[PDB]
Design a protein around this ligand. Structure first.
Ligand SMILES: O=[N+]([O-])c1cccc(O)c1
Ligand SMILES: O=[N+]([O-])c1cccc(O)c1
Ligand SMILES: [Zn+2]
Ligand SMILES: [Zn+2]
Ligand SMILES: [Zn+2]
Ligand SMILES: [Zn+2]
Lengths: 360, 360
């Protein structure tokens, strides 16, 4: 059975289980069950399932080289699908809440969930909470008897926490750290001294890399009972490298990819985000260019946004991106070679993850 | 050592552990650590600690009748304090998010967290997420080696999920169920047919009773390794009775307790909430009174709110509350007697919980 069809079939199974349990144990009525079914479909479906399918693909790699009964292969693949959906539902939680936090308009070609007429922010904040709860309901039901349950839940909660910490780093990245204060309204930085590579790398590591790359790779190892057969420091290092490249791509697309293709209007400039474009521009600009950037960044005024995008263009940041990409290729290939010492099979799964990321 | 001082000392310990770990493992800087320290204090402190201290008091009851080394007594009480703070932090999560969802102005005499000038909704939604994450970070750290970890985490997540489901029941309680639809903006009910005792009881059971009464009582049993020594169906039944009374009190206070004493301005009438007052009024009103209620309920117009409060007064609902209270006393005393068959010690802890609730 092809992997994607198995993954989608398991979605239907998990949805049916969750909604039936709401009826049998939480006294839910049919109309609220329908609302939650639509909420689940709208928030969890429609992406590429990169994260969830990485769990399945890692598990498939070990199945190809490991002796198992057929029923065990089926069990492991079912577990990989459930675990993949745990990650997809975690992402769905963060996208629902982040779109509210940021006042976002569109996602995946459609209105953000909180903007649906019958949802509103009052319901959507709680819907996001339910999405996160469902990740745990899934795990306890499907993995109740599994040897990896404790490790999986502990990993999942640390990744969730890291992601929340990363969200804090992201939403505060345009303020001066020494002025953070719940009592005082926060002004945007004027000096942009905290727009550095090291600070950017911290934002991305926590806000994206743990849940997008580390969690799927390690969950795939756990459902395969294969974690002891890799060097976990290498898994972390390669996750944090590929995840950074993934975010840099997304940063470049926020500014330069046409909205029809991105699925939304990018607003990183207006939001004064610490993006790869802004850090790299500030790393090569002259004084006059720095001053013009400062005079126009972080403003909803479209003329000011056009100034910034013009500065980025004239700064030939496409050349910095090519240099950055070539260095990532060097380092990822090096880490893949190191992974081969202990697990050639896992190294190949990582190579696939990199290829998919590099060519998306 | 008095119980409350132990509980407050453990708060300081848990805070220090969480903030130190953010520094040592999550690369946090001092100013963001300070922001999170202030957020923790502002959202988690200042209440009565009823829920957290119930864990401690249940554990203390078993310590008085169970043979243990002194070091074991200290361990059990420390665990009860950590578990109590898990519940207090869970409540803090829900209060932060609910105040945003509802547009609330004040809580506990102070502005709601999202209204602090240096917070804003963008940060406060994520701060609430962090509060919930911290409940799990606490558990995994302090309870790593404990026999009750699996049961405790499974109970905690089911109670969390129930609470989110209850929030859904609450925020949708003024709409007609058959018209719920993410695609269509939701009108307030005109017939109030779903303002019934059974529907009210479902809202309260899920939104309040599981985390306010069931979770502290059972967590106290788990850290005492005493759950097998009670009839769990009775624990559930008595939690759902006392929790309903607690909410009915809060509903009456929303309408009639002066804001200086309540800590906020009550808005249940303007918000068209399915409150005990509205259900009980609709259960005894004549046709003309029903019509006047319908013409004025669910409106921010202060004159319409005064109409409703006048209808409540003239309806002598204080007599319904006295009748309701007398019936709760009958049923709680009956359940306490039944709890004595297997655990006279636990029955006494429940009697204390009831006394504190009844007299607050
Ligand atoms: O492009 N991605 O986002 C991606 C590709 C492959 C795996 C993964 O977890 C994420
Ligand atoms: O009044 N309360 O909210 C209360 C009293 C005693 C225990 C408890 O969990 C809650
Ligand atoms: Zn965001
Ligand atoms: Zn972006
Ligand atoms: Zn509310
Ligand atoms: Zn209330």
């Amino acid at each position: 059975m092809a992997s994607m069809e198995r993954f989608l079939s398991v979605y239907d199974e998990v949805q049916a289980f969750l909604l039936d349990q709401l009826q049998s144990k939480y006294e839910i009525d049919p109309n609220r069950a329908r609302y939650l079914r639509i909420m689940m479909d709208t928030t969890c479906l429609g992406g590429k399932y990169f994260r969830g399918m990485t769990v399945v693909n890692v598990a498939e790699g070990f199945l190809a080289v490991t002796q198992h009964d057929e029923a065990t292969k089926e069990r492991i693949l079912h577990d990989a699908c459930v675990g993949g959906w745990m990650i997809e539902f975690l992402q769905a939680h963060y996208l629902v809440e982040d779109d509210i936090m940021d006042g976002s308009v569109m996602r995946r070609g459609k209105p953000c969930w909180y903007r649906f007429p019958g949802v509103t922010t009052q319901c959507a904040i709680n819907d996001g909470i339910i999405l996160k709860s469902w990740t745990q309901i899934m795990a306890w039901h499907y993995f109740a008897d599994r040897p990896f349950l404790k490790d999986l839940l502990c990993l999942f909660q640390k990744v969730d926490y890291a992601t929340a910490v990363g969200q804090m780093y992201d939403v505060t990245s345009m303020c001066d750290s020494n002025k953070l204060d719940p009592e005082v309204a926060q002004p945007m930085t004027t000096d942009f001294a905290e727009f550095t590579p090291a600070i950017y790398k911290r934002i991305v590591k926590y806000k994206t890399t743990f849940y997008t790359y580390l969690l799927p790779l390690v969950m795939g190892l756990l459902v395969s009972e294969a974690a002891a057969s890799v060097e976990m420091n290498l898994v972390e290092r390669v996750a944090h490298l590929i995840g950074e490249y993934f975010q840099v791509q997304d940063d470049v697309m926020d500014c330069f990819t046409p909205p029809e293709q991105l699925g939304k209007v990018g607003t990183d400039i207006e939001d004064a985000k610490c993006s790869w474009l802004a850090v790299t521009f500030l790393g090569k600009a002259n004084a006059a260019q720095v001053a013009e950037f400062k005079a126009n960044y972080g403003e909803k005024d479209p003329a000011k946004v056009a100034v910034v995008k013009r500065l980025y263009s004239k700064a030939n940041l496409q050349a910095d991106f090519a240099a950055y990409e070539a260095e990532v290729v060097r380092e990822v290939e090096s880490l893949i070679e190191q992974l081969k010492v202990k697990s050639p099979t896992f190294a190949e799964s990582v190579a696939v993850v990199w290829e998919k990321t590099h060519k998306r």
